A paper describes a structure:
The axoneme, a cytoskeletal scaffold of cilia, typically exhibits a “9 + 2” microtubule arrangement in motile cilia, comprising 9 peripheral doublet microtubules (DMTs), inner and outer dynein arms (IDAs and ODAs), radial spokes (RSs), and nexin-dynein regulatory complexes (N-DRCs), all surrounding a central pair of microtubules named the central apparatus (CA). The CA primarily governs ciliary motility, functioning as a mechanical force distributor that interfaces with RSs to transmit signals throughout the axoneme. The mouse sperm CA structure is an asymmetric complex with various projections around the C1 and C2 microtubules. In addition to microtubules, CA organization can be classified into four categories: (1) microtubule outer surface proteins (MOSPs) in C1 and C2, (2) five large projections (C1a/C1e, C1b, C2a, and C2b), (3) MIPs within the C1 and C2 lumens, and (4) the bridge linking C1 and C2.
Subtomogram averaging (STA) enabled CA reconstruction at a resolution of up to 5.5 Å, providing well-resolved tertiary structures to build models of 39 CA-associated proteins. Our final model of the 32-nm CA repeating unit in mouse sperm comprises 260 tubulin and 206 non-tubulin chains. Among these, there are 45 different polypeptide chains, including 39 known proteins and 6 unknown proteins. And among the 39 known proteins, there are eight proteins newly identified as CA components: GRK3, ANKMY1, LRRC43, GOT1L1, LRRD1, MAP1S, GMCL1 (BTBD16), and SPACA9. Additionally, we provided more complete structural models for four previously identified proteins: CFAP47, HYDIN, CFAP99, and KIF9. Each microtubule consists of 13 protofilaments with seams facing each other at their connecting bridge. In the CA structure, C1 and C2 are tightly connected through four parts: a central bridge, HYDIN, and two lateral connections between adjacent projections of C1a/C1b and C2a/C2b. Specifically, HYDIN forms a semicircular chain that encircles C1 and C2, with its N-terminal half driving the C1–C2 connection and its C-terminal half providing axial support in C2. CFAP47, the core structural component of the bridge, binds C1 through its N-terminal domains, interacts with HYDIN via its central CFAP47-ring, and anchors to C2 through its C-terminal region. SPACA9 specifically binds at the intradimer interface between α- and β-tubulin, arranging itself in a spiral layout along the microtubule with an 8-nm longitudinal periodicity.
Numbering used by the authors:
A (entry chain A2): 674 to 808
B (entry chain 4N): 297 to 345
C (entry chain 4Q): 236 to 602
D (entry chain 4V), E (entry chain 4W): 16 to 404
């Protein structure tokens, strides 16, 4: 359910990792024992495991360089940090509906986190366009 | 990680609860201390007179 | 005129006020005058309502001698200094204050500083000082114990996050059996660091000491990168700016913090870690999710610790009383809070402390 | 007092006498149930060299307060902070009732109407009639289903008058649905009923601390106003401590402070300072994750000790030929429940087998053990034979 | 309750600020002093962590209650053989009155009247009148004596109506003379008056239990109907745990049984079950002869320290030339004693010297030590000369 263009280019800098399931899901309290949105995926995915297996084999210096390889390598490399960012973003969105008011000290750390995440996403999109131009 | 820190700063709402808790401690004593001093003002006025 | 309960000379040419002395002038309105000082008024104790607006008054020390002064009005004057704010703070009855149109009125630091000092004020420049506003001014000036600790830890998290990261060796997959970590907190060098070193001596196959960092150059007797990471203040600040700090604590205007890589290096092998900790660092640690075994090491004999620090030599005169006060504070905090620390051991004798630590470790791991 | 039942049980020379009815949670050795974490925490507490010898706080211990509020109002509760609930570190266990009675006779003296379950008649009536409050009964316990049936509670919804002091006993089995619950509160709010709760055994009533008072969390989420009593030293293992907590619930924020302005004078004129040393074990489990977990599997062992042993005893009764599968025994929540045995069967137990129990056939299932489980099943079985027919 | 003294002392920033009324038992430095037996007491409580934690009944763990019974009865007298005397577990600083005043009001229907001391009314009679009572007052804390004075006491005794109750509270300042004992007895006999006593600081009112109870020993030898209010949270000093007892005397065994039954009912109402931690902590020091004797010796030493502080304050105030009599401080007994200060001296101390104490100035002299008392007396002398001059 992850969407790209007609060639495989990233189309988002805020939530590009949201699949169809994340998009159809909203912010509500979870069921009694049903796992969260990420738990079942992590138990049943091979997404974050490709990052680990590439790390086992020297992630950044291997033969077979190309545009698609560059795009996928960058996506998989930044996926860990940006997925942590997305988890804390969905935590913030749930807090938006919690109303269980927290101290404003929690707001500034979240602001810094989302600022860094947005900068990372925008630079990743620019670097996508940059390798496309290179090829 | 931050869920724990989210809950710890939820307990900082006790400080936010302490905001008015110690206002009460002072709002009815910042008036009595002013009122307590008025007890020594009118007793010597007519006494001197 | 001893019976003079009120006096009013507004709009006159009063240069300086004299002669009044101890008159029971409860209300004094002297606006639109040429008043320059506050002389003569200081003993007007019965003066609760003072009006000196549209005047030429600058210094206000002496109106604070009006132990009953409740309302002060000095709008449109030549007041510029903030010392009178501390002076009028000593008024337990000052409830209304007016300082508009003044040059002092231009620096909102005056505004929130009046709000902070004068918690007894109910009104400042014709507004009512609010409930949350006074402690907002509190959190604008002084750094709160738990709240400055919170801000330091949040800034640590912000700077550590803002850089690329990696799966840490200190984070083990086993949730209920993670990397074994130990924290021994207490006053300044009460042997708790020596206790940790002794633990690494006997339990060499179990533990390995973790050295805290510092902004301070190497003091004599302390091994570099073994007791403290004696780096400069600039490197200390930078390696938070580079995303490697999670905590700090300040001693003698020198900050001491923990780099994550210190835990990563020891956890990279599998042997446990032991680090001596301190109050501000403990606050920053408890605000975090980190899971060591919290241990407070305190010598209850405050006089013995006092003499020990005085005879240690490397400390000046004032460095002993601070540590004694910290000892007492730790004792009170741990004796008042149930289920607070995982363990607390005496530091009056290193031998009994180490015996207690050894039996605690043996009952922990079932050795 | 009428302590003579257990007293003559103690005087009973019958070796196989078994008072299976004293409500406190047991080990199978006849001791009140203790856990290893209790002895451990007693061991670490023994290392305290110095003392803070001043009066203990009256609001309660911070971790203890947080635990009490989250158990009685929810892990995700909002009424905890803005004084829509209450927690007061009272003396003993009946101190909450007496403070509430003082508040009633001071402010709510205009109402002398009390609506309760029949099992709470004498219990709460002692305290209420000590100040003149009239008590009215409805038996929401079922003498046929041998549990608390929701149906006569939906009838009691019409039975209850307006604006009474509702004392709640064992409503766990009165399992309404969520819409039925909403109808229940719509009836209550239309009658201005002010309820009074008491949860001294949270954790062992249903096996989960949340499920015991989950209906209470949903009560306070609607803005209800009610008092409550709570104790946790019982189901934990340290029974003898006996220091409870008064729990308030309301909507207005400043009114609780106004009530506390008088409660302070009350508490000063009544005791002044209750103890909290025993509560250190309580927090030692309820705060740390490893001890919380270990004591939770200890609780699950206790769960197997009553309700799983309930099932095994029932299977043994079926094997012995006891008519009817005593499923209501397993269906009764908590460690205590009526058997439905008549007077002439309780008397058979007490005389022939000297298995003592109150006249209402309400035994305590934590007293059931696997040591002489054959004897217990045989005693119940022969009671059924010789007294049912 | 405005506990302004300690809180303002803690929140003050003056380096030479000094508090003279620490709420608990003091060293020469301001620490929560304990007898050397408490360090052993904690160790000899921890030898039994494998307890099953059996409840405390309405009577409680009668080891503690009985030990305190022989305490307040006197381990030296023979009032027990008269089987007219009993006692009941109380909690905190007020349960003794909560039982005794309630019983006296309820069952002495013809006697709703008491003549009390006004000075110790703040501690005794406020709880006494909390049980719905009508009280006459003798304010024997004379202006000249600045301590409890038997003169106006016996003067009010003369005008006491037939069928009243007499209160002799924590006013050991009135070490009533033998002639005053006989005059009191003669006035009581002609009117059938019921004596009442309150010593919340046994071993602290004068130093030893027997000296605190000297006139109490005389009354016990007389064999009268009297109650003995007491709070072991203040005499032994478990202010944290907060546990004590009340003692009743009557003229027959059936009356004593009625007292015991009514007080058990009042216990079931007020707290139901007494706490165990404080009870066992008190037991550990009461039952053990070594701990009990050394506690008595050390408490006598602390009381003599208090007396030394009183004498030193008096002598330094008279030496510096401070106006007014000063032997009134030594006339006062127990850790509580006035200084006879005016509002102006107190306000000057609070403002400039940051020494906090009420106008009555009933300071705990164990707080003051021989190290800072010189500066304290100099500051008081300065306050008096600058405010009263």
């Amino acid at each position: 359910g992850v969407k790209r263009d007609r060639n495989g280019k990233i189309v988002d800098t805020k939530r590009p990792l949201f699949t169809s399931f994340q998009e159809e899901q909203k912010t509500m309290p979870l069921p009694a024992n049903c796992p969260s949105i990420a738990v079942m995926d992590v138990a049943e995915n091979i997404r974050a495991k490709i990052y680990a297996v590439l790390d086992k084999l020297d992630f950044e210096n291997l033969p077979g360089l190309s545009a698609e390889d560059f795009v996928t390598l960058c996506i998989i490399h930044r996926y860990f940090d940006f997925k942590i960012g997305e988890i804390w973003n969905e935590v913030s969105e749930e807090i938006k509906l919690e109303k269980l008011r927290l101290v404003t000290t929690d707001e500034k750390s979240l602001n810094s986190i989302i600022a860094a995440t947005e900068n990372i996403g925008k630079m990743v999109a620019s670097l996508q366009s940059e390798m496309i131009e290179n090829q | 990680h931050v869920r724990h820190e989210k809950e710890v700063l939820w307990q900082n709402r006790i400080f936010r609860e302490k905001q008015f808790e110690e206002r009460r401690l002072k709002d009815f004593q910042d008036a009595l201390d002013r009122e307590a001093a008025l007890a020594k003002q009118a007793k010597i006025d007519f006494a001197e007179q | 005129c001893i019976s003079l309960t009120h006096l009013s000379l507004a709009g006159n040419k009063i240069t300086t006020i004299k002669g009044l002395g101890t008159l029971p002038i409860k209300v004094l309105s002297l606006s639109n005058n040429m008043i320059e000082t506050i002389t003569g008024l200081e003993e007007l104790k019965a003066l609760q309502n003072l009006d000196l607006s549209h005047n030429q008054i600058s210094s206000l020390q002496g109106l604070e001698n009006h132990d009953l002064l409740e309302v002060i009005n000095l709008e449109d004057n030549k007041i510029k200094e903030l010392s009178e704010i501390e002076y009028i703070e000593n008024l337990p009855i000052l409830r209304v204050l007016n300082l508009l149109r003044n040059p002092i009125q231009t620096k909102p630091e005056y505004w929130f500083f009046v709000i902070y000092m004068l918690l007894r004020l109910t009104e400042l420049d014709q507004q009512k000082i609010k409930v949350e506003e006074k402690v907002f001014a509190v959190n604008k000036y002084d750094p709160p114990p738990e709240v400055v600790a919170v801000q330091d830890h949040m800034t640590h998290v912000v700077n550590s996050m803002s850089q690329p990261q990696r799966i840490w060796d200190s984070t083990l997959p086993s949730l209920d059996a993670p990397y074994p970590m130990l924290i021994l907190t207490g006053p300044a060098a009460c042997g708790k660091r020596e206790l940790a070193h002794r633990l690494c001596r006997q339990f060499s196959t179990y533990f390995r000491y973790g050295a805290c960092h510092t902004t301070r150059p190497p003091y004599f007797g302390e091994g570099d990168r073994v007791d403290y990471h004696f780096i400069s203040q600039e490197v200390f600040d930078e390696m938070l700016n580079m995303g490697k700090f999670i905590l700090t604590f300040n001693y003698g205007n020198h900050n001491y913090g923990l780099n994550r890589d210190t835990i990563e290096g020891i956890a990279r092998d599998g042997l446990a870690s032991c680090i001596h900790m301190e109050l501000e660092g403990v606050r920053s640690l408890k605000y975090s999710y980190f899971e060591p075994r919290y241990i407070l090491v305190v010598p209850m004999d405050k006089e013995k610790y006092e003499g020990y620090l005085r005879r240690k030599g490397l400390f000046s005169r004032a460095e002993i009383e601070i540590a004694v006060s910290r000892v007492d504070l730790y004792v009170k905090v741990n004796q008042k809070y149930p289920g607070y620390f995982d363990a607390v051991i005496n530091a009056d004798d290193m031998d009994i402390a180490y015996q207690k630590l050894s039996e605690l470790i043996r009952e922990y791991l079932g050795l | 007092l009428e302590g003579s039942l257990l007293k003559i049980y103690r005087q009973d020379g019958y070796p196989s006498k078994l008072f299976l009815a004293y409500k406190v949670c047991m080990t199978e050795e006849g001791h009140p149930w203790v856990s290893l974490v209790v002895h451990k925490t007693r061991l670490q507490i023994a290392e305290d060299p110095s003392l803070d010898y001043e009066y203990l706080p009256l609001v309660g211990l911070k971790s203890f307060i947080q635990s009490s509020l989250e158990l009685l109002f929810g892990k995700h509760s909002e009424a905890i902070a803005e004084k829509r609930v209450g927690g007061v570190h009272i003396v003993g266990e009946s101190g909450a009732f007496q403070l509430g009675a003082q508040f009633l006779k001071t402010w709510r003296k205009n109402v002398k109407i009390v609506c309760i379950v029949s099992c709470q008649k004498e219990q709460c009536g002692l305290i209420f009639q000590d100040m003149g409050f009239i008590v009215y009964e409805y038996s929401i316990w079922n003498a046929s289903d041998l549990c608390s049936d929701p149906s006569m509670f939906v009838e009691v919804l019409q039975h209850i008058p307006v604006g009474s002091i509702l004392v709640i006993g064992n409503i766990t089995d009165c399992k309404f649905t969520q819409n039925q619950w909403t109808k229940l509160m719509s009836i209550i709010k239309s009658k201005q009923i002010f309820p009074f709760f008491d949860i001294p055994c949270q954790g062992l009533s249903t096996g989960d601390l949340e499920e015991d008072t989950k209906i209470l969390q949903y009560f306070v989420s609607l803005g209800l106003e009610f008092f409550c009593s709570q104790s946790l030293s019982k189901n934990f293992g340290i029974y003898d401590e006996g220091v409870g907590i008064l729990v308030v619930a309301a909507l207005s924020n400043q009114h609780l402070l106004c009530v506390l302005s008088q409660l302070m004078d009350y508490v000063q004129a009544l005791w002044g300072n209750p103890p909290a040393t025993g509560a250190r074990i309580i927090t030692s489990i309820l705060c740390n994750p490893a001890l919380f977990g270990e004591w939770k599997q200890s609780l699950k062992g206790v769960v197997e000790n009553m309700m799983l042993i309930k099932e095994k005893v029932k299977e043994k009764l079926r094997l012995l030929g006891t008519p009817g599968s005593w499923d209501h025994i397993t269906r009764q929540s908590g460690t205590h429940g009526y058997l439905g045995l008549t007077y002439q069967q309780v008397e058979f137990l007490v005389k022939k087998k000297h298995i003592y129990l109150p006249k209402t056939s309400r035994i305590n299932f934590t007293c059931i053990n696997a040591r002489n489980i054959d004897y217990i099943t045989q005693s119940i079985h022969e009671a059924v034979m010789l007294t049912e027919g």
